[PDB]
């Protein structure tokens, strides 16, 4: 069996930079609307025996890529596909993990009971919300993690990262705050609402490093550099897998004081960075092809949580 | 066990009709959207041990519609209801029913999958675009028909039906016109193209009557509309059970020679009604209220089949 | 359909509890071992077309007591059980619900699986250390809260409840914490560890009172009181709803400066209580009382979630 | 994809005895015990892509064992081994296999389908109590028997052996002591209890060999045997695939007339074997290894069921 | 049959208390006046097959509530509910059990046959002035007791309770302060009038609990007051289940020695309190609330005799 990729319409360019790095040419298939706006595919090529990997974020009209993404799995699973991964870079629904107190759906269930059903043998993602979610497949799930590129660009765009503080938003993902710390060997300092928010850590006169796994509409984040503003930090910085940056999102950013909002390209970013100046994006697709060339290969996947290839 | 009917928001107005002919309000639900358009649900009244239906049609953004129903389904599951219907008037990508010759998905296949991944116990539909989609379910699925008001629409409303003629517009469909006839005692007259068409039956001086499950693009009902007006009908009517209109179809009927347009509401209907004059609704709420109070009841459902309730 | 109780031999105490409180007697099983040490069990009374619950908690021999779950739950099945639910008060491996970066088992999961296959149809269990357990289930689970229970302890035993202070031990259960305080209308300082612990909000003078889902070795919790002491806390109290109290638990809270180390009845206490005089129970069984008569009933379980029955 | 062998905690020594005969080492795995008794399991080398066997015996703490084999299975299927077999020499609950008239669990089918949802892709065990239980699973099971290696044991150990007599202890078991005389050319004495006990053919100044598929209490064995020394047996000896030697078992043997108890290792005898001189151990290890390495590449299983390798 | 809870004019707050208790909203019910003074009721939703619980007081104008009462039950029993339950917490004339050596009514069996004939299946009352008034229906009658509040608020607010006594006011109802000293195991001192009192059972420098079914013109309560005051007792406090407070009552409570004068609020006590600092009220909903809870769903009502729920 041989490797092949396929794009979904929400990450073209994504998918390009991944059959790229993998020496491919992306598989021939048709991703448009009937009349009626419901999802047409077409494989335009045999998959019969081979390894396919769809490309697809949960971004843009989350529901349609969704769709398109179950539709596509659908038509390699029946066309004889030796086995199809949905590489899924940010899973959508992946807020909705729980219940809680109320009655609402546990929407990620739902949405990894489509994905199984619909034939993936396999799923790759980057930065569950919750790693929990990988729990809610039968079939394996690889969570990459963005870490090393995340150690990578602040090593060498941070010129006082020795000195730095990184610092968690919301008290929920402390975890990556502390292992991104732990790898840089600095101080991380904390923070978490009570309309205030308190803080530890010594910030003053440093730079301090917001650390999440996805700003949406920014209320997190911008709450939590007022805060490290107040207490005196030079400048401050955050740093995110997902850049979903919906709503008023772009407007809070362009009025807060971050020196710069870096995301990964799990989520396209140009229409956004052209009404942002201070967004700048890391590529993660090296992580991606190695992850899918490894699984093809039967290489260890775990070796690129704390390896930039 | 009570009946608690739900609405997607699909088709608030067809859902509220239901409603009022069972002698019952709407279950309190919110079904908005994320600031990332992510569909939320908030079921707002407790459904544990509840004959639960979920009332939504496969129309207007339809992949949006179809996760809100599945996630409304997934949510009333695990919140105990005793059972779950979904009540899709008009079952999307029925029209994908299968591959024929291309490297297609089944897209009704996989809609059906995730009905019943979902959770959902029992389907209530109507005029399904192909019957043997009943056999791509597992679970019971009632395939109501909209003929028993069709005819009762061509009684009351075409003077001179005694001679009539019933015309399908492609092979595919003639059973349904065949059914219509029988039961009016009338010729069913045919047509299918070879850009040309081929008509069968006395058409001259008389009313044609074309009747199909679906108009979406309206392509076929007009090519078969000229082909009939070629051959000296004096009226020409168009009945349908689901009235899609998407594309140019709103123009195409506005410059045809359609007496009428008449189709149900599976699908609403007053938006298009606005820019097209010849089209008219026939209500089918009270079969739908009927079917699921029958199921409800442990009553014959097939009744329903040849009987206006 | 009638409620028949069974008891697991985890917790005998806790099910005759339940059972006087719901006006019934435990029903008859024979639950035992073979010389081999296989579990045996032996349903005495029908339970044809009968509601049957059966409890057994996550605690002391815990493979032992899965399994004797898992064997009860099989039997009750396939002897016509009309509808079977498992009563677990605190579920086994639930601290197993992740990867993360190891090569290692979503032991909760595999649980899930397990329950499931076995043949329940229903999951009732108190304050699961993840929630998101909850998407591990197709079947619907009830996650109840020692939360109302802990309320009223705190209000009936501590008389300067107005003026303490609700402390997180561990900033990934803070969530409780905040819920208990908006409860009470107090502040919620914070602690974590950096082998060294800081501390958020104001405890001198003061009663500090950690909440936490479990105390197991009671590292945890010692770590946060002596913190909680150095910054000149009056006494300091930790409420817990499982106290599983492994290994060196039982020493180390006897030689802490606990005033008091409260914890539900869903594990057995007493052994426990005979070696630590500071320890005090919280009994949760009207709570599970009332969870098992409200969904026999069609009742709202979620009410409980607020209020004391 | 390439074999690997993981022993879990039951039977080291056979699984090491085994990975010797395939030529491989043991797979690093971690496999102990949480303070609060909960099993830890994890996998100390990426086993993506490969083969994995998993040895574990249903023996000694059965309800831990049972555990730890599925908690393995389970972090290796989401670990993306290709494939995943179970290696049970002595399958545990395999005497629960039926109800008959009580309202018992049917354990041996719960067994089944736990290490189905588990993720084992094939089951190999040996001598099955009843090989109906390879239908309580849909993967493939391969029960192999000690047939040979019995065999072989009688003709380099018993002088007499072309006089002597094969008797099954319960009538149950019968078939495997016919097949054993007709390989030997021997007559096939009966023993069946009416407490007393029935025996049909000549035994006296011959040897007797009883043979069955377990001793667990020796209650069986040593009925027969006394029946058999009532008929003037010169020597009576037992020969058993499972060991289990539960209870009252080795005093029973140490005061009963066997001249030899030969079991295989298919359960640790060491233990035993210090208390009881009389106990000596059959090495089936050869036969799973080359079942393992059969199944590996595409094999013969079944031409083990008449050859010793 | 669903719980249907309807209101009448007496007691709206009370009903409304009910029915949030049982998770329920009151039933739409007009309950007016005509022009004439002449009782107007409406059912606003259908009852035919339900279970109609209808909440009335014997108290305000208690000839117009008790017509009230009886044209709602005629209402609803002709509109064919499936059973129709007064919900009486005070009946109205129960004062008036016997004649005894008059020429007068038993207005209390004239009630209870009007009750009947209305079509009442079903009676649950609190504290009836006489048990015996059971007797006076055929249906059957519920008759709730206030005593396991009373007890909990004895506990929860007399600081000396240990040490206290309950007072009987007459000798007729010592039955009830015998049954409260023995669950509080406390002497029962007793009262009765000769314009003098006679008292047994030291009081001096105790607490002492008058205990009495109700309070009217409060005569009854002050005179024994006043004697336990000569008996030097440290405090007095009066404790009734029903607080009618009709006549000059306010004005004796306020110029007599009372410590607390609690009554349950089977009568609705906020215009009265505003006149009455020394009035506390035990809130009783949840015990008539259960009580309708156990009688829909055929479970024990005595078990609420020594429960609080
Ligand atoms: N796409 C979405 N956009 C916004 N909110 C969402 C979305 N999906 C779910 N939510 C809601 O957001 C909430 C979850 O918030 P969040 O993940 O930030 O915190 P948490 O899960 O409570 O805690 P934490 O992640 O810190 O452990 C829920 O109320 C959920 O319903
Ligand atoms: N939503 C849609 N809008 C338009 N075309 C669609 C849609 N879904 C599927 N199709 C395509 O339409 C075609 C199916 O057409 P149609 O149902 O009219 O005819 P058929 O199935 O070939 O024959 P018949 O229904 O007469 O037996 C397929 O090529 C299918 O891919
Ligand atoms: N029974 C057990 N006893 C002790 N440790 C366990 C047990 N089961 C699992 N663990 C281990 O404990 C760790 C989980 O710890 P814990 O739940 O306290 O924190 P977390 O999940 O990392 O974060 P948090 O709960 O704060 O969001 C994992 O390494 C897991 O393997
Ligand atoms: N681990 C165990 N130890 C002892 N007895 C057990 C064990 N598991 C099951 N049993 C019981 O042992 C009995 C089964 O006995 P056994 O297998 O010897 O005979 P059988 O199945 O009736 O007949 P046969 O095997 O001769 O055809 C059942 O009553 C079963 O409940
Ligand atoms: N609503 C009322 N208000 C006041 N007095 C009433 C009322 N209804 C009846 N009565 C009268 O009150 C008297 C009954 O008094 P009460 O119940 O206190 O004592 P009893 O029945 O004689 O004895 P006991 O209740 O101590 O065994 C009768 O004379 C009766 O006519
Ligand atoms: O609230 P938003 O800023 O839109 O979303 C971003 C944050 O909200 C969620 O908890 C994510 O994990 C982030 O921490
Ligand atoms: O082609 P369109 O007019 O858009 O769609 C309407 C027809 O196309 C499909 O076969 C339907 O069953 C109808 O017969
Ligand atoms: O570490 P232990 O004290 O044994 O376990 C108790 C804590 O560890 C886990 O995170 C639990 O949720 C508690 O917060
Ligand atoms: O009764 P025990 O001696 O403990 O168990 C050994 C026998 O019991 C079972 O039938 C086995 O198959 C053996 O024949
Ligand atoms: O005389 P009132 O104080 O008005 O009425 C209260 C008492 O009178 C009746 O016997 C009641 O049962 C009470 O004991
Ligand atoms: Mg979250
Ligand atoms: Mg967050
Ligand atoms: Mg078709
Ligand atoms: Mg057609
Ligand atoms: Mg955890
Ligand atoms: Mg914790
Ligand atoms: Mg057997
Ligand atoms: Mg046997
Ligand atoms: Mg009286
Ligand atoms: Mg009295």
Chains 1, 2, 3, 4, 5 share one sequence.
Not at 115 to 124: C, E, K, N
Not at 261 to 290: F, G, R, W, Y
């Amino acid at each position: 069996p041989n490797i092949k990729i396929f794009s979904g319409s929400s990450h073209q360019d994504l998918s390009q930079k991944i059959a790229d790095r993998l020496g491919l040419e992306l598989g021939k298939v048709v991703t448009k609307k009937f009349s009626n706006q419901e999802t047409c595919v077409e494989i335009g090529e045999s998959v019969r025996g081979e390894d396919v990997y769809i490309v697809q974020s949960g971004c843009g009209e989350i529901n349609d890529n969704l769709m398109e993404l179950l539709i596509m799995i659908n038509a390699c699973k029946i066309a004889s596909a030796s086995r199809v991964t949905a590489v899924i870079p940010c899973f959508p629904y992946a807020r909705q993990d729980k219940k809680d107190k109320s009655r609402a759906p546990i929407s990620a269930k739902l949405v990894a009971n489509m994905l199984s059903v619909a034939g993936a043998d396999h799923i790759i993602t980057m930065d569950l919300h919750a790693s929990q979610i990988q729990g809610f497949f039968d079939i394996p799930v690889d969570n990459l993690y963005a870490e090393p590129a995340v150690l990578k660009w602040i090593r060498e765009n941070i010129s006082e990262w020795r000195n730095c503080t990184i610092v968690s938003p919301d008290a929920g993902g402390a975890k990556r705050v502390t292992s991104i710390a732990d790898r840089l060997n600095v101080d991380f300092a904390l923070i978490h609402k009570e309309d205030r928010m308190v803080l530890v850590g010594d910030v003053k006169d440093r730079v301090a490093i917001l650390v999440d796994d996805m700003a949406d509409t920014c209320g997190t984040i911008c709450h939590a550099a007022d805060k490290l503003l107040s207490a005196g930090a030079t400048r401050v910085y955050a740093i995110l897998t997902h850049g979903i940056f919906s709503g008023p999102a772009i407007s809070r950013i362009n009025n807060a004081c971050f020196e710069a909002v870096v995301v990964t390209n799990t989520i396209p970013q140009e229409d956004k960075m052209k009404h942002c100046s201070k967004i700048q994006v890391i590529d993660i697709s090296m992580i991606l092809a190695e992850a899918i060339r490894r699984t093809h290969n039967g290489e260890s996947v775990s070796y690129l949580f704390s390896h930039v290839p």
